Amino acid sequence: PLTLNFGSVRLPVSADGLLHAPTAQQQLGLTQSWEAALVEHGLPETYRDFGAGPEAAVSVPDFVALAFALDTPEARRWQKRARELLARAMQGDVRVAAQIAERNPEPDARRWLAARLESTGARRELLATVARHGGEGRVYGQLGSISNRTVLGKVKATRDGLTSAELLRLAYIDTVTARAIQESEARGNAAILTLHEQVARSERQSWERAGQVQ
């Protein structure tokens, strides 16, 4: 019996991420028959296991579509939540990020987030260090490209599609380049990129050597 805990509301959810329709109805103030609501709002008729055998189910995007189609006070709260969520997401409210993270049924999802945040931490300190060491123009993108070539084997949005392992390798490479720039007192795009690419090739060759059948 899995649930989506969205604030005080506890919406029971199927294995493939569909809400119990009856709980969704009382949660949108929908007193209409489900069969009549299905037809009016153009929703599929489907059933899932929540405990009490097979019961009507609605996807989360269809739930949100219903919230925005209706005018009941209940539907109007859900509309308000969406507007406040958009405001807070755009503002960078880490309270909301943590609430969303903690809503994911898979603990491995929050482990991915930890690796993702280590990567942004390292990238940020690398870009700041490069800025102070006379980095200009394209250097910030060029750094990203080198890091992504080496780990992927072939930048902020590409990292949303990397595994947690790939992200930790990126975080390491970036933190090491930052350390090497600080120590070298290397200056300018050419020297900085030569140094970053060096760190990047050294770590890849390291992985490849350790991965040989012995």
Place this chain on the structure above:
Amino acid sequence: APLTLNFGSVRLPVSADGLLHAPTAQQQLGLTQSWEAALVEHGLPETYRDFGAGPEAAVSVPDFVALAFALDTPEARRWQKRARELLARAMQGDVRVAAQIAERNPEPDARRWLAARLESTGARRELLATVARHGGEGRVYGQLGSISNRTVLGKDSASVRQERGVKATRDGLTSAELLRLAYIDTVTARAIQESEARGNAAILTLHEQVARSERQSWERAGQVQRVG
């Protein structure tokens, strides 16, 4: 000098205190009239910030959202849809959108606050599973820990705990040290898998090679001449 608020494809010029450049906000909601006309019609605050090119009209994001839902333009409705898309993803616990929110916040103590509230990177956990799958048990799990503590911290786990005055080792570890340990844990896991290493002996020898390779990368970056 110039700051931009990134939200999916949209790049909004933003002040240091998180207000939006009102002109860009206008075309983003298909607002045709002067900002001056807009201020009185919707009752918005007259605000100005330096976005990089001098004093220009500004609007907060909560006021921006309110406009997007008050207006009925094509542009306004694309933002209404971003809100519906975001509620759906928020309800399902999409850690990708949690990441994008966190990255919009420049306050570094916010990343720390959030990072804290989260779990590990699972790098330690996955190594232990891999070692077990390739045929290994005993104090081998304890030994893999001790091999990696030697290389990163310079001494034994207990030796680090007394010099730093900590009951548990991980309370005494820097952000840097934690990453270096997770990195070693990551690299060895895939090396064991690729090399097809089997047995305690073979898993421990490869782990030493990786941890020792790490220390040398770190030492080289810092131009450290370690005597050992």
